[PDB]
């Protein structure tokens, strides 16, 4: 009786419409014989998924005939899958800034695994940071202080990954984190326990409140080698490259005045410069005072060997597998975020489907820019968007992962049924 996802695929946009039309005619003639569950199961598990994919949502067979005929009559361009169903998606865990008011409300209601994960984190974040992460992610005002933002964003990140794996059968092929995103990446990769990773973000953000107001940051659409050249040429020692997000994008960090002066000059040369909303200048010497204290706070963190490929933005070789001890988290906060190099390594290793598990996409464009620079066809998906209605939870993200060609377990969403004599399109 509930709405089901009917997968349809072909070799071209026109052949996919021909497939939709034959299926609609068949479904219309056999609707009294075929159970909708059996047909959805057959289309997902009894058919080899071809490159040009789509899916129609419908609660009953007559509804599916309308949806299928709509596809068949349309003039839509269906992009082909970039992955070959052999590698799982690369989950991208972005930094701060993705947060929005009541970002967790619909997923707490529509996804039981999201709710269960947030429930686990609730007493840990309460003991560590002194606040309710559930109250924070469902409040009518967006979460605000660094000590509250980081645990709340981390909690959404890990709850999204748990839902995708447990509820939708999507095991990640690899993980990539960007600054605070690396704590969620460490949990998902099996490098840290959920609790130790929560302790890492809670303690990290509490210590950062001590240095709030110490420097400023700025984004510039210039490659990092060029930015560094300008700093050295201008005799600037108080501002450094803090983030390397794409081959054409760089974030600088340092003293408030020199950062403002540099952005003023870049803008005047018609370059895409802009100040970034910060209290502290992370991944710069501004964080130096709090590094001894952080090392001490994280001395008890128990790191583990990652179970999934982890593309480190902290290590000098992103392919190297992290030892997520306190020293790693101190380096994570102080070293440049080499995000572009980590994404480039994953793409060189064969990954083409990237999905950003965050409250709102911050690094979708960065992933696309790295793919474009390698002359590769990649998919950079967003797990959630600000104020996006999610009445069917993350089922939308599952559809887009399927459409893109990410490897996933179809027995999670279609656990049982009878194979039906539905049409098999010619080669």
UniProtKB/Swiss-Prot annotation:
Cellular compartments annotated: Cell membrane
UniProt superkingdom: Bacteria
Residue numbers annotated as active site: 179 (for acyltransferase activity)
Region annotated Acyltransferase, chain positions: 89-408
Assembly notes: Homodimer whose monomers probably have a head to tail arrangement.
Function: Catalyzes the elongation of long-chain fatty acyl-CoA with 3 or 4 methylmalonyl-CoA (not malonyl-CoA) as the elongating agent to form tri- or tetramethylated-branched fatty acids known as mycocerosyl lipids.
Protein name: Mycocerosic acid synthase
Organism expressing this protein natively: Mycobacterium bovis (strain ATCC BAA-935 / AF2122/97)
Portion of the full-length sequence here: 447 to 871 of 2111
